Amino acid sequence: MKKLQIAVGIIRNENNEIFITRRAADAHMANKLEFPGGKIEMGETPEQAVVRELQEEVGITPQHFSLFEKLEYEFPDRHITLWFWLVERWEGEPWGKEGQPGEWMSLVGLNADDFPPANEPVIAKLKRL
Numbered sequence: 001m002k003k004l005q006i007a008v009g010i011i012r013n014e015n016n017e018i019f020i021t022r023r024a025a026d027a028h029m030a031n032k033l034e035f036p037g038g039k040i041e042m043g044e045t046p047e048q049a050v051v052r053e054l055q056e057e058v059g060i061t062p063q064h065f066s067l068f069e070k071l072e073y074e075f076p077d078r079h080i081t082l083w084f085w086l087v088e089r090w091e092g093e094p095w096g097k098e099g100q101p102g103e104w105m106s107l108v109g110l111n112a113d114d115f116p117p118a119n120e121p122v123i124a125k126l127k128r129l
């Protein structure tokens with residue numbers, strides 16, 4: 001009964017663009033362009049898990065809050081929970097502790113190709129805008 005939760009939040013920049021983590025630099029599998037919000041599982045709740053890890057995945061002080069969407073699926077003998085949170089602003093630069101340097105990119109034109117294909121069902125909704 002192995003289960004693991006993950007909570008993410010696309011940080012909204014000052015130009016209707018959101019900063020995401022593009023596999024940091026490379027480390028193989030560059031098509032895993034993901035966003036901050038990893039490790040909320042630990043022992044928190046869908047509410048404090050992200051809110052708490054947010055500081056750890058943002059570090060800065062951004063007007064960030066609200067959930068855009070949430071995906072709950074369990075792999076063949078695995079339980080992976082992924083919550084997509086919505087962000088409206090962020091002061092300075094996002095650091096927290098995601099571990100994958102990113103840049104301010106327009107979310108309105110996010111690509112399911114650069115990001116992980118295993119998380120398309122979620123993007124399939126926003127991707128179509």
Ligand SMILES: Nc1nc2c([nH]c(=O)n2[C@H]2C[C@H](O)[C@@H](COP(=O)(O)O)O2)c(=O)[nH]1
Nearest residue numbers: 004005006008034038039080082116118119
């Ligand atoms: N957004 C997103 N999260 C994912 C994908 N695949 C995947 O294992 N995760 C999550 C679930 C796990 O709890 C966790 C494993 O790596 P971390 O320890 O770096 O968070 O990340 C994915 O394709 N998209």
Ligand SMILES: [Mg+2]
Nearest residue numbers: 038039053056
């Ligand atoms: Mg974390």
